[PDB]
Design a protein around this ligand. Structure first.
Ligand SMILES: *C(=O)[C@H](C[C@@H]1CCCNC1=O)NC(=O)[C@H](CCCC)NC(=O)/C=C/c1ccccc1
Ligand SMILES: *C(=O)[C@H](C[C@@H]1CCCNC1=O)NC(=O)[C@H](CCCC)NC(=O)/C=C/c1ccccc1
Lengths: 303, 303
């Protein structure tokens, strides 16, 4: 029993983190086979983040402008190229610790683990969700750029996020490992801000199932609801619409608890309309939306 | 910016996890140098957990009764002994991945990372606090016994917890790595239950400082309070007394924010008396007490 925000074990990713310096800027890189991946803004000076032509800065750079350090072993850069908003630095040594891996782009509402790093050295690990507005609510200080987000299945690491910047609201923006930003964000200095966010409805329902599996039952009721009348209430409270696919995805949790999805939807509607009146669910006084149905099943396996 | 429940990178500990089987019971062991540490209840049968004489079961066991598997390599047990509630299984191979390590016992109110494991294979990592009543609120299923809790400083792993059991309330109990239980709990079948818990006051104040560092300021006020009048209110709300040492420990966070500790205490008193009236702090509608002052400083380094 018990339910926690749980990250994947970070060992396989720790072995891939290196330090990348260009000019006076140091950040983190990801060392897989003979390539080091890092944010391309490492080549920017502060005189040129208003409107950097990243191409421009890059043609003016050479291999020796990039210092790559793996622990206390310098790697020699033998090639450099740009892939969207990421740099690929070819090095003369393949990483002996390279795990089986994939580069995957995730969907809003999906979760992943972040290995926060500074100067190529891991500092901590935590779980994030990709928000509907393509930001993440992380914990990132200056120097954390190039830290990565990932999931593990079996022992293949699926990398899904590389960290690039913080927005004025204190949330974070980054790319997939092909260097394509999540959301309408750019690696140049603008007044860019997060657009309007919403609550991940299917995840809230997953977490209510987690609560029932762990013996929190006070919010349950007889009532059921129609999907249509549920989505009418969800819309009013800035919740994403619930689709039939979401209902299907919640199937296994519904079977294990014996609580039909639309039965649980009636509980959520009443929580949205009444609040909790001083009670908590799984230690929370708010409805939690950063656990996917998979997260719940994986952690709550057989109670 | 940002503040998350962050665990230590788990890589150094992942390399120490093995699988231990005795009879039909399988659980996890910790492999350091040529010793494997595991809960002694691995030698119990279900016919004998009412009143096991653990000594008895152990004299009746031989080295070959213990099957130790490290990945897919069986380790040969060449000696076995009991150390309080932990078994020490001497094996014929020293773990080549043994980190620098220490066995440390922690205090109620201190935090640590848990590497949840099943069949010697790590599943996830999360942060726990030792509750004032010496339980932990973890996430543990059958088979998780022998998973360990730890902190890292520099690159020395300080192991502080080994998991043994779940209480009827769904919280968890375990030992230090010398096999001495935290709290009044025993590795035998009783109606044992967690005693009365309290809120870790110094940690709540640390987390309020975290919030201020991250731009959450709405709960602040002019008021200051005396330590005596604060502790009168804390007592009423089941909060631990705040000592002058706690005040001193909060010194650096007070300096960085420019908010005196007793100034922040006045904010906490009003939160305790009024609630938040619909607002949140660092994404929480409850006052969070599982971040130590160190946790905050380490994560909030320079904003
Ligand atoms: C990379 O290490 C660094 C991390 C940031 C910076 C400190 C705050 N938290 C983080 O994650 N990334 C940058 O410094 C980045 C480079 C921009 C590309 C030219 N810029 C930002 O993060 C912008 C912060 C900001 C916030 C509000 C208004 C303007 C700028
Ligand atoms: C070890 O792997 C296992 C883990 C437990 C069991 C399932 C629930 N969550 C856990 O962490 N530990 C045990 O099974 C343990 C062995 C007891 C020593 C003889 N016993 C318990 O955890 C007791 C659970 C319980 C709860 C309420 C009433 C009675 C028993």
């Amino acid at each position: 029993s018990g339910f926690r925000k749980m990250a994947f074990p970070s060992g396989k990713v720790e072995g891939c983190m290196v330090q990348v310096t260009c000019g006076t800027t140091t950040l983190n890189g990801l060392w897989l086979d003979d390539v080091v991946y890092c944010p391309r803004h490492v080549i920017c000076t502060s005189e040129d983040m208003l409107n950097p032509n990243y191409e421009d800065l890059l043609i003016r750079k050479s291999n020796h402008n990039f210092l790559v350090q793996a622990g206390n072993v310098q790697l020699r850069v033998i090639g450099h190229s740009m892939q969207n908003c990421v740099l690929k630095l070819k090095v003369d040594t393949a990483n002996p610790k390279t795990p089986k891996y994939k580069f995957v782009r995730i969907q809003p509402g999906q979760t992943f683990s972040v290995l926060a790093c500074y100067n190529g050295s891991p500092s901590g690990v935590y779980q994030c969700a990709m928000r509907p507005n393509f930001t993440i609510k992380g914990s990132f200080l200056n120097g954390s750029c190039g830290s990565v987000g990932f999931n593990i299945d079996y022992d293949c690491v699926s990398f899904c996020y590389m960290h690039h910047m913080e927005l004025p609201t204190g949330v974070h923006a980054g790319t997939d490992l092909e260097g394509n930003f999540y959301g309408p964000f750019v690696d140049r200095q603008t007044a860019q801000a997060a657009g309007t966010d919403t609550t991940i409805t299917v995840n809230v329902l997953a977490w209510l199932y987690a609560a029932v599996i762990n013996g929190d039952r006070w919010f349950l009721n007889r009532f059921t609801t129609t999907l249509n009348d549920f989505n009418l209430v969800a819309m009013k409270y800035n919740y994403e619409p619930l689709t039939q696919d979401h209902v299907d995805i919640l199937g296994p949790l519904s079977a294990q608890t014996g609580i039909a999805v639309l039965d649980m939807c009636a509980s959520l509607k009443e929580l949205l309309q009444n609040g909790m009146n001083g009670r908590t669910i799984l230690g929370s006084a708010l409805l939690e939306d950063e656990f996917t149905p998979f997260d719940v099943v994986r952690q709550c396996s057989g109670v």
